[PDB]
Amino acid sequence: RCVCRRGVCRCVCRRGVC
């Protein structure tokens, strides 16, 4: 699960569970 916003991808992981 990585959240991308207009090319900016940031992985909001669940404490190690990305």
SS3 per-residue string spanning the chain: CCEEECCEEECCCECCEC
- Chain-centroid distance, C-alpha 1: 5
- Return d(Cα 8, Cα 15) in angstroms, integer: 20
Do the Cβ atoms of 3 and 13 come closer than 8 Å?
no
From which experimental method does this structure derive? NMR
- Return d(Cα 7, Cα 17) in angstroms, integer: 22
Calculate ∠ Cα 6-17-2, nearest 5°. 10
CA distance to 1, 3, 13, 15, per residue, from 7 (Å): 15, 9, 18, 23
